[PDB]
RNA sequence: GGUCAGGUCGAGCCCGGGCUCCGUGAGGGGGGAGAAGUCGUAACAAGGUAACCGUAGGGGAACCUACGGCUCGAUCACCUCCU
RNA sequence: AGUGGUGGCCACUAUUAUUGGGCCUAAAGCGGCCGUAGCCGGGCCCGUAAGUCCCUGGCGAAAUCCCACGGCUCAACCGUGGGGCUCGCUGGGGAUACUGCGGGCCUUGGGACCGGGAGAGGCCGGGGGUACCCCCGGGGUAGGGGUGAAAUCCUAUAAUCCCGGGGGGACCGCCAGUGGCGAAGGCGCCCGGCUGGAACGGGUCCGACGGUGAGCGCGGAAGGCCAGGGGAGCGAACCGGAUUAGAUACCCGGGUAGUCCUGGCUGUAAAGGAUGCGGGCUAGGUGUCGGGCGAGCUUCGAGCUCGCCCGGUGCCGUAGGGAAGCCGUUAAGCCCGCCGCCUGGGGAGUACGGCCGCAAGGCUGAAACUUAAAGGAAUUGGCGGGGGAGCACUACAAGGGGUGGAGCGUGCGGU
RNA sequence: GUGGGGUAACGGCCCACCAAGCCGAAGAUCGGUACGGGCCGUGAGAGCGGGAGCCCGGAGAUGGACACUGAGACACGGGUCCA
């Protein structure tokens, strides 16, 4: 999980923690669908 | 590998009250655990529908503080009766729901918990499941594990056994150490799949007696009759080439007709549901245990 | 620290360093691996000939306001369908259904879209081999 | 001591740029040989031998007196130890590391959770191995000679 | 860890120049350094340079006449023929024959101008202007 | 219940080099790991559950390490131990969240007779001695002799072999292979994604170290034989026929290709080869009953 | 030169299998451009509970909670840097 | 007699940086240490002459490149002559400064050793600390608890509270600070033992044994996970009370996992000094920490005052540096050594593939497409449910008068 | 490596026997990509790119395979077969 610090300045975007959690959830679902 | 449990050897005898009307704490605990696992299990009509079991997690799902061995034993039973597909990665457990599950649950969700468990076990026995093999072994007149050990060899001999090979092989694997547990030690320290099969049936028509490492089991012929005709009502299940001997058959004969096990609408509904979907559940059982 | 290795014998490591980091540029990558070619609709052809299939107007990008006409063109060379901006005031009247037309890059930044109108990458230069600019000037006539 | 602790400390020691031995010193080049063999027969390594020479015997350094057997070379305690065969055959400076390493191995075998001491082991082992890498290149050791965690106990 | 005496020496010289100190003391003296120091003194960039035996590595002492702009040690020892000093001259010196370059040829370390008059190329080792 | 390992699918691929004399560090660590595993696992007689954990050896993987003061991954150890069990040179029992090991009769003898023999040769004699007696791996080898080229052949072969009832010497081991096939054929026959290794696969490796050569992913794990090595192998086999045919007939094509081949150099010197031959011939009954115990119901 | 026995090259042909590319594809997801539509106030001043990071649970979303860290925090009193 | 449009290529571009790029705050120095190949490497003496340089033999075709003259009217083109061309090659000779290679000498680099002193260096055993929760008995009635308010909850079966006694788990306050130690994460009750490391003082020994490190290895805050124990308080999820238009929260009452022990995994963070590490140099002043040195005081202490050297650690600050913020011998200045990392924003840390892990997930990592900027410092204003100061009738405290209730005058909106 | 066949000619080129070697992190193998060179375009130059027109060397005749005659061919305007 490469982490670009520039993605943490909150203007025009959500707190980076929550987008990270969202994308992780997406990854879990996609892997599960393939199994 | 070994597929063994400790400590809970006496835990599974508490289903003896299922055929009665008395309800103890253990029985209601089991009734609470079973539906919990069933709902937890996924179902969608292989590697895409398997949930891992983490004991520290499935202990607060219902505020229980239950030891792991009990949890292992209960799903062992659920598989042994063909209600739950279990895959054991080394020191890990993975759970999937079957076709019969989410059909018995689908139609009989509103029955009493005790009768829900009872009908679940009955439906399991009704179809070609490992439990039905043990039931037919009893009907042929087995007393202990050794007769089952002979009957499995007999069944794999005929080469129609391909549908249920791996289940029998797992039983044989377990027996290869349950026999050791009872051969020399009076303490039945561990539980094999055979004992889990004996219990559950004890919750229907059998009676078990722990005896110096052994599991001496006897039938109660009234209920055995009360379910024999039910089995013959829908003959969508093979005897696996076994045959009832005399004494069991005649003891079935010449009896006072005990009460039908449940309400009559329950019996006919259970008949119809499995009749109109027998093929799919049989194929699922082939996936469970069948090879080709 | 000092830029390294400034050694008299270390020419190798210098060469691998530079070759490695030349991939960090994007245009060198686009040249070497030929990515534009493997994504090309025009396969590097400065012009093309196609058949118009429909006239479509487009709203400009705000804060600019206006309606720009164009045509969706199926290209004979490979069959793909792409939009094509029509230049010149009062010009789309001279482009119609099922028209042999000649189409050409539109020359925006990076070879992209021009100005307000995005996405569109190409423009119409001749219809039935007859120069669009001429007919916009109106001295000639479409066949 | 910037080798691993990476601190720039300086407790080193100084001598004056005297090219000839002092005049006030009195012992003869053979007298110092007798005294150093006497000390070495007690079981003293070279360092403390030199300390005894400088402190009580007052000899600022053996380096100042040239080798009688070789004018091109300056007399050293260790060369004299070679002369009488009392020089060691492993380099001493490595033998201390050997003994320290085995002792620490014992201590940590009693104490399997002192990860700091484990890193200390990881540190010292590189010291023996680098000095062996040097000495092989010089030929003061057998060319097959190889430390072992077990054989080193014997030494 | 010290690697070369020469880069440190000329760095010391350039540092001392801007501050303007009179005397300097280059600690790691070597046989090469003296052959260097002779050259620009012959061209006048410095006053006397004296060796001092410290007993370990010798120290060179120089007083500065305030006529150095920068004195660098070209470290990667470029070899060069005679017909192409003009290129390298354009790399380290500011104008036509301004300053010098120092090269080492088969004879020894010596200034580049007399080298081209003697017509002997070699390894560039320093420059000062 | 499934048996298999993640990750190290291609770790035993490096074992094939032992056919030649080429040396690779992977093979070096494989040999060292085999040596250590056999060293620590004892030959107790467990035939009980209590005998395990009393006269067995508990395996602490973190303790197992190469001689570099470098940790070695667990799945490699799992594979190398599963192989040793598969060849009968060791006995494994997975007591919950633990692994226990005990030597067999083949062990403590194959090591005992060839102590001062080269490491590569030591491992080589271990595989051959595993093959020469009634081993499930031997069943796979005879299946190959019949002309089995993939897992499908082994599946059909064992299904037929269970149509005899004279199959009680390797019943549970072959059932374990059957279920491993059931649960890994889907991987290696559907979706073409290889992430686990069945028991048939670890059997195919080792054979590839002796006489076989196994291709890589076609989904499956297709294989081929080497007739030159097969000649010497079958010669040694027929020298000591202390292992049943299991009712598996040799295809005539393989027999003629054995005939069409010339003589290829024996696996070892004929002196140690004869030593192995006669020591196996001597103690066949004891080893046979031991393998009957830990592969058969009675 | 014809016919037959054999050898060599062997173009091709049939079957089985391994691999790759293109087309079309039911069906599933997310990414971006538009502004109209709807819900909510998350952040920027202490953004009305400081903010952010690592980890895990929950929630329609903004998000909330929990433990360890950070000053990319303020008002100040201030341990206090200056004084 | 051309000019315009599109596409492709070099310049622009020090936006590929050997010449010659950046990584504290914008892209980028890695979470830390070790070490292999490789690269860079102390001084002096003897030798070789591979590299290096000079001379010379052959050769590297023509056309083409440059130049003078000549021919076509000059030119383009061609001829004669001169010089270069990728030229990487090769024979012989000469030099030895340096790199290389070989033999000898030397400590300053380095490493070892020894002696007082310092320290939350780590590990093990024992001992102790106040506080909290539970339990028992006595006193004692009528509430406690909590909040902006309350409410839930506890309580008369005796609560809260005070006293006597017993049990349980966690943690070691004040002394405490920019202290100290450690490679980093991190480390604090007292004693006994084992063990690492450094400084300081001494050449006391050895002699370049060194720096860096691709590939490798090692341990490494929290949280999560596996197996068994444990569970005082706290408190993820969850259960209620309350708040609100709505409250899946903030507030309150509970409450499982976790927090602790043993044995493993997971290899993580704004792991930040957002500063990868070693050497040489470059104005200063000032404190604290440890060691040494010199004086003086001393109720004679490992006590007390002043200066210096060494090592560690802060502040101010000259020149210098930098977009500035700021740094400035603890550089982010000038040189010398070695790796990684960066090349407009997003798509993205994604797809696909590989490896690892039991699992969560870790390491590696594009493309199409989209966009005129993103981003950094700093100035002025405006604003803050920031802070400070000074004000009042368009502010309030004191007092008084009085409107909107009825009617009407007047006018606003609407018919 | 030994000892031979075949070639105009040395040569695993080929045959028989013997032995286990050869290449790889200084990038083997595999894949993508391409006739090589003298030269050509741009740039102050380091350098970057391109190999079509002319000359040298290379190779090819619908794809593949094969033989006669010849000093020279498996032969663009000789021959045979498959597709």
């Amino acid at each position: 999980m490469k982490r670009r610090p520039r993605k943490w300045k909150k203007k025009g975007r959500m707190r980076w923690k929550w987008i990270k959690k969202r994308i992780r959830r997406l990854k879990r679902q996609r892997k599960k669908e393939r199994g | 590998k070994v597929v063994g449990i400790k400590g809970s050897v006496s835990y599974l005898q508490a289903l003896k009250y299922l055929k009665t009307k008395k309800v103890t704490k253990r029985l209601k605990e089991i009734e609470k655990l079973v539906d919990t696992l069933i709902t937890l299990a996924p179902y969608a009509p292989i590697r895409k529908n398997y949930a891992k079991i983490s004991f520290n997690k499935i202990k607060t799902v219902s505020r229980s503080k239950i030891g792991s061995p009990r949890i292992k034993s209960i799903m062992l039973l659920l598989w042994n009766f063909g209600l739950l597909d279990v895959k054991i990665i080394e020191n890990s457990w993975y759970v999937r729901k079957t076709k019969l599950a989410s059909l018995l649950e689908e139609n009989f969700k509103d029955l009493s918990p005790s009768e829900k468990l009872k009908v679940y076990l009955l439906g399991g026995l009704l179809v070609d499941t490992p439990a039905r093999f043990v039931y037919r072994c009893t009907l042929n007149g087995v007393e202990d594990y050794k007769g089952v050990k002979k009957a499995i060899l007999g069944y794999l001999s005929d080469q129609r056994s391909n549908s249920l090979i791996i289940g029998l092989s797992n039983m044989l694997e377990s027996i290869k150490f349950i026999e050791e547990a009872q051969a020399y030690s009076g303490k039945k320290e561990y539980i094999g799949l055979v004992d889990v099969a004996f219990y559950g049936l004890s919750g229907l028509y059998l009676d078990v007696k722990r005896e110096s490492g052994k599991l001496t089991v006897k039938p109660n012929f009234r209920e055995l009759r009360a379910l024999y005709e039910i089995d013959k009502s829908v003959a969508t299940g093979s005897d696996y080439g076994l045959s009832i001997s005399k004494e069991i058959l005649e003891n079935l004969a010449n009896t006072k007709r005990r009460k039908t096990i449940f309400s009559e609408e329950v019996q006919e509904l259970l008949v119809n549901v499995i009749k109109e979907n027998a093929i799919s559940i049989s194929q699922d059982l082939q996936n469970m245990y069948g090879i080709i | 620290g000092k830029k390294a290795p400034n050694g008299e014998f270390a020419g190798r490591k210098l060469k691998l360093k530079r070759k490695k980091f030349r991939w960090s540029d994007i245009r060198y990558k686009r040249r070497v691996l030929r990515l534009k070619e493997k994504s090309d609709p025009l396969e590097g052809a400065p012009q093309a000939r196609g058949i118009v299939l429909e006239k479509i107007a487009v709203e400009a990008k705000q804060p600019n306001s206006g309606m720009r006409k164009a045509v969706r063109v199926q290209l004979i060379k490979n069959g793909k369908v792409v939009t094509a901006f029509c230049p010149g005031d009062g010009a789309i009247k001279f482009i119609d259904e099922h028209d042999e037309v000649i189409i050409e890059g539109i020359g925006g930044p990076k070879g992209g879209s021009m100005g307000d109108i995005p996405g569109i990458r190409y423009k119409v230069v001749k219809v039935n081999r007859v120069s669009l600019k001429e007919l916009v000037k109106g001295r000639k006539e479409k066949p | 001591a910037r080798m691993h602790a990476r601190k720039r400390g300086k407790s080193g020691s100084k001598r004056p740029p005297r090219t000839a031995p002092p005049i006030w010193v009195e012992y003869t080049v053979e007298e110092i040989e007798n005294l150093v063999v006497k000390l070495r027969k007690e079981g003293y390594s070279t360092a403390m031998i030199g300390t005894i020479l400088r402190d009580q015997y007052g000899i600022p350094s053996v380096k100042l007196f040239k080798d009688p057997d070789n004018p091109n070379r300056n007399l050293t305690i260790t060369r004299i130890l070679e002369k009488h065969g009392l020089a060691p055959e492993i380099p001493e400076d490595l033998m201390f590391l050997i003994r320290r390493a085995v002792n620490l191995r014992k201590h940590l075998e009693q104490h399997p959770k002192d990860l700091h001491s484990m890193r200390g082991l990881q540190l010292i082992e590189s010291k023996i191995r680098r000095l062996v890498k040097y000495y092989k290149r010089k030929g003061k050791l057998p060319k097959n000679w190889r430390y072992d965690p077990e054989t080193a106990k014997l030494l | 860890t010290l690697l070369d005496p020469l880069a440190n020496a000329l760095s010391h010289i350039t540092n001392s120049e801007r501050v303007g100190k009179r005397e300097v003391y280059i600690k790691p003296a070597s046989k090469l350094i003296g052959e260097v120091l002779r050259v620009m003194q012959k061209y006048g960039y410095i006053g006397e340079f004296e060796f001092i035996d410290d007993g370990r590595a010798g120290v060179y002492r120089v007083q500065l006449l305030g006529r150095i702009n920068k004195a660098g040690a070209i470290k990667p020892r470029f070899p060069v023929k005679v017909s192409e000093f003009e290129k390298w001259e354009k790399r380290f010196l500011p104008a036509f024959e301004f300053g010098i370059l120092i090269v080492s040829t088969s004879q020894g370390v010596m200034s580049h101008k007399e080298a081209i008059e003697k017509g002997i190329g070699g390894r560039l080792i320093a420059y000062v202007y």
Side-chain angles (χ1 to χ4, degrees), chain A, chain B, chain C, chain D, chain E:
Chain A
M1 186 54 93
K2 307 200 153 38
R3 282 208 330 284
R4 338 182 179 199
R6 180 162 159 162
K7 302 285 259 170
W8 305 336
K9 314 170 175 192
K10 208 173 179 166
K11 179 178 179 177
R13 82 201 70 176
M14 319 158 40
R15 170 171 191 192
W16 152 258
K17 231 173 199 169
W18 312 139
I19 313 111
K20 180 160 171 167
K21 199 182 176 201
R22 273 175 57 163
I23 170 172
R24 283 196 159 143
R25 288 177 177 172
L26 191 173
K27 286 177 46 160
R28 316 214 194 188
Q29 165 294 349
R30 274 208 221 158
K31 120 177 186 175
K32 164 92 191 143
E33 159 270 326
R34 198 160 312 193
Chain B
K1 181 192 214 177
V2 287
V3 197
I5 315 94
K6 303 165 54 165
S8 317
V9 288
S10 324
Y11 176 49
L12 272 296
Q13 67 99 61
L15 304 94
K16 73 199 298 315
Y17 315 117
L18 189 44
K19 54 208 174 170
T20 83
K21 53 223 181 292
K22 191 148 293 313
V23 166
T24 82
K25 58 208 303 308
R26 292 223 225 286
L27 183 59
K28 60 194 299 313
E29 184 220 47
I30 288 288
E31 281 161 23
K32 178 84 174 299
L33 192 41
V34 161
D35 41 354
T36 308
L37 280 164
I38 288 299
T39 50
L40 177 135
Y43 170 72
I46 291 168
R47 156 48 40 213
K48 316 163 179 178
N49 39 5
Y50 284 75
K52 200 177 191 167
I53 302 302
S54 196
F55 302 145
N56 211 47
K57 160 222 73 183
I58 174 146
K59 186 180 300 206
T60 319
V61 293
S62 170
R63 267 63 137 160
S64 47
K65 171 47 221 81
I66 281 162
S68 153
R70 327 281 269 271
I71 308 162
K72 282 161 155 170
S73 46
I74 177 52
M75 335 156 280
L76 277 203
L77 160 61
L78 272 299
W79 165 67
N80 216 331
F81 278 54
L83 273 301
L84 193 141
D85 190 14
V86 50
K87 314 299 184 48
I88 304 191
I89 310 309
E90 168 268 344
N91 304 309
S92 280
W93 293 64
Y94 291 78
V95 165
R96 188 211 58 183
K97 235 194 294 199
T98 84
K99 177 54 159 291
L100 213 50
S102 89
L103 251 176
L104 330 174
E105 177 27 33
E106 193 262 283
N107 68 339
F108 300 152
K109 59 223 153 296
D110 47 358
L111 268 295
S112 96
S114 64
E115 302 323 302
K116 254 177 75 161
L117 179 54
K118 226 155 154 185
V119 68
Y120 283 179
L121 299 210
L122 175 57
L125 262 300
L126 270 172
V127 307
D128 303 286
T129 188
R132 161 161 188 80
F133 184 86
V134 187
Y135 145 75
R136 289 298 311 175
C137 206
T138 44
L139 259 183
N140 180 225
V142 64
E143 172 49 57
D144 252 15
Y145 71 106
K146 311 186 201 184
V148 187
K149 159 171 170 171
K150 299 299 299 315
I152 57 184
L153 304 167
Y155 185 40
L156 56 90
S157 322
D158 59 65
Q159 305 309 281
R160 184 45 271 143
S161 178
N162 282 331
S163 299
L164 261 64
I165 281 294
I166 57 176
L168 267 66
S169 69
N170 300 9
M171 281 146 187
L172 188 38
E173 219 305 317
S174 41
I175 278 298
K176 212 254 169 201
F177 309 90
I178 300 329
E179 163 163 51
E180 305 164 344
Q182 62 209 139
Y184 94 110
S185 156
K187 171 63 200 231
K188 205 180 210 80
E189 183 40 64
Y190 286 69
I191 287 297
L193 314 171
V194 282
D195 314 328
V196 193
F198 289 150
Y199 297 122
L201 301 155
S202 96
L204 252 183
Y205 74 90
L206 285 177
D207 51 88
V208 187
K209 170 176 166 197
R210 151 166 55 174
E211 190 142 33
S212 289
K214 254 183 166 217
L215 222 67
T216 66
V217 49
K218 292 306 293 142
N220 208 325
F221 313 98
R222 320 192 44 88
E223 313 93 296
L224 184 130
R225 167 56 85 103
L227 64 100
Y228 187 83
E229 80 301 34
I230 311 191
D231 186 19
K232 308 311 127 198
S233 84
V234 190
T236 321
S238 86
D239 63 80
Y240 315 107
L242 289 314
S243 168
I244 45 154
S245 100
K246 166 39 56 184
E247 62 280 2
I248 321 92
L249 178 54
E250 65 89 5
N251 282 312
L252 285 191
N254 54 254
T255 75
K256 164 66 204 90
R257 307 296 135 212
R258 209 179 170 82
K259 58 222 185 321
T260 290
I261 184 61
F262 322 110
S263 162
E264 320 314 313
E265 39 72 18
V266 170
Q267 313 321 82
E268 64 90 45
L269 198 35
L270 192 75
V271 162
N272 272 315
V273 163
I274 74 169
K275 254 171 183 160
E276 313 328 308
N277 307 269
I279 46 161
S280 69
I281 60 181
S282 68
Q283 181 42 245
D284 175 30
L285 290 152
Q286 210 71 10
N287 306 128
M288 263 294 180
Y289 324 104
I291 325 300
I292 193 76
Chain C
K2 191 185 182 177
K3 193 167 72 156
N6 212 45
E8 38 179 55
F9 308 116
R12 36 172 58 196
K13 183 63 231 60
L14 275 52
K15 189 44 149 35
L16 312 84
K17 168 176 163 188
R18 162 65 183 291
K19 188 197 178 180
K20 161 177 190 168
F21 285 111
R22 194 177 311 96
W23 282 119
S24 46
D25 159 38
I26 320 315
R27 188 36 184 161
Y28 183 78
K29 205 228 202 208
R30 277 189 72 97
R31 170 259 288 288
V32 165
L33 261 294
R34 309 190 85 264
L35 299 324
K36 194 200 168 186
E37 299 94 302
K38 275 183 288 311
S39 58
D40 210 345
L42 266 173
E43 61 274 16
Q47 295 81 14
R49 170 197 57 188
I51 293 295
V52 164
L53 265 299
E54 184 38 74
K55 323 195 203 201
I56 310 96
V58 190
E59 209 207 319
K61 238 57 184 181
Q62 294 311 309
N64 226 20
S65 71
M67 272 275 287
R68 324 269 189 161
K69 266 61 69 187
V71 281
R72 266 201 100 184
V73 184
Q74 209 269 23
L75 155 57
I76 317 182
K77 216 160 187 195
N78 56 4
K80 281 162 188 164
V81 283
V82 169
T83 79
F85 165 64
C86 159
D89 188 5
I92 200 67
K93 331 307 166 283
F94 284 21
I95 305 104
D96 315 315
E97 270 297 300
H98 305 73
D99 287 2
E100 199 271 7
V101 282
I102 311 304
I103 319 95
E104 159 134 38
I106 219 165
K110 291 181 173 163
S113 285
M114 171 285 258
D116 58 335
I117 307 129
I120 176 58
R121 292 201 225 283
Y122 314 120
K123 50 177 192 164
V124 189
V125 285
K126 327 182 190 190
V127 58
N128 302 351
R129 261 94 161 157
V130 171
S131 314
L132 255 289
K133 191 184 182 187
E134 251 305 334
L135 297 181
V136 165
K137 284 197 169 188
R139 315 161 183 191
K140 319 302 165 226
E141 173 44 70
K142 164 183 169 172
Chain D
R2 331 198 322 272
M3 25 53 66
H4 283 154
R6 277 168 171 72
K7 297 303 182 186
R8 320 177 183 184
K10 166 53 195 62
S11 42
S13 72
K14 289 76 48 171
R15 281 316 302 190
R18 278 179 162 175
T19 323
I23 318 85
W24 54 281
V25 77
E26 57 276 22
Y27 289 81
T28 61
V29 186
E30 189 65 18
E31 273 171 312
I32 166 172
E33 188 183 15
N34 312 132
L35 288 164
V36 299
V37 63
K38 180 194 159 192
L39 287 168
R40 185 70 203 72
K41 287 181 279 221
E42 324 162 295
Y44 281 43
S45 87
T46 88
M48 63 286 301
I49 278 164
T51 77
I52 291 293
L53 262 286
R54 183 216 59 220
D55 214 22
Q56 172 253 283
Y57 295 84
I59 320 304
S61 174
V62 68
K63 164 262 176 168
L64 329 171
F65 306 87
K66 289 191 178 179
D67 205 313
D69 313 328
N70 198 314
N72 298 346
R73 279 202 62 72
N74 316 65
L75 188 70
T76 88
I77 296 151
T78 81
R79 216 180 172 214
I80 300 157
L81 301 195
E82 307 161 339
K83 152 62 202 65
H84 305 280
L86 292 178
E89 59 85 30
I90 302 287
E92 46 269 21
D93 48 4
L94 222 36
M95 271 305 327
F96 320 79
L97 301 184
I98 288 305
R99 87 188 79 265
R100 281 214 288 201
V102 293
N103 160 270
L104 185 100
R105 279 182 168 279
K106 275 307 180 185
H107 149 79
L108 71 87
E109 270 308 313
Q110 211 279 348
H111 292 116
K113 314 202 311 302
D114 190 356
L115 294 160
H116 294 69
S117 277
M118 280 330 323
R119 198 165 170 288
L121 171 152
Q122 281 182 5
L123 208 76
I124 277 163
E125 85 85 41
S126 286
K127 264 184 191 172
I128 318 87
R129 280 188 174 71
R130 287 157 82 157
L131 278 180
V132 167
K133 163 180 170 186
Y134 159 67
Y135 275 109
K136 268 188 168 193
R137 209 152 63 259
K138 172 160 280 296
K140 298 237 166 217
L141 293 177
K143 304 83 171 193
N144 58 348
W145 150 243
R146 168 46 44 228
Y147 165 108
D148 180 71
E150 312 302 279
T151 292
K153 287 188 132 180
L154 170 138
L155 254 292
Chain E
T1 80
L2 72 84
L3 314 184
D4 79 81
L6 289 294
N8 288 332
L10 313 190
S11 325
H12 190 337
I13 290 302
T14 322
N15 269 356
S16 310
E17 184 277 346
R18 325 182 288 272
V19 67
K21 283 188 177 171
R22 313 307 314 127
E23 301 275 20
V24 304
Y25 298 81
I26 297 156
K27 169 63 221 70
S30 96
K31 182 188 162 186
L32 167 39
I33 304 180
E35 278 156 290
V36 180
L37 294 162
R38 176 211 298 115
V39 171
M40 71 304 297
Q41 186 207 48
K42 146 196 307 170
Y43 297 67
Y45 278 89
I46 55 184
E48 73 92 355
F49 61 95
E50 63 161 341
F51 179 91
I52 309 160
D53 160 81
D54 54 15
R56 276 73 150 279
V59 165
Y60 272 126
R61 214 280 307 285
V62 170
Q63 85 293 37
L64 292 45
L65 319 181
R67 43 199 75 165
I68 278 74
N69 300 303
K70 44 183 311 173
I74 303 299
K75 182 52 168 166
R77 306 307 195 76
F78 288 106
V80 287
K81 322 296 210 167
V82 195
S83 50
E84 75 313 346
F85 268 71
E86 191 215 339
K87 130 62 196 177
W88 298 92
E89 271 305 0
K90 271 191 194 58
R91 201 158 130 161
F92 312 130
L93 304 193
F96 159 66
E97 277 204 302
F98 199 116
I100 80 195
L101 315 177
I102 307 193
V103 285
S104 191
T105 63
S106 69
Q107 285 78 5
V109 152
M110 61 76 58
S111 102
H112 94 286
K113 286 204 182 174
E114 176 39 49
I116 170 165
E117 317 323 328
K118 220 181 305 315
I120 314 183
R123 297 287 181 82
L124 294 101
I125 62 164
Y127 82 108
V128 47
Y129 79 94

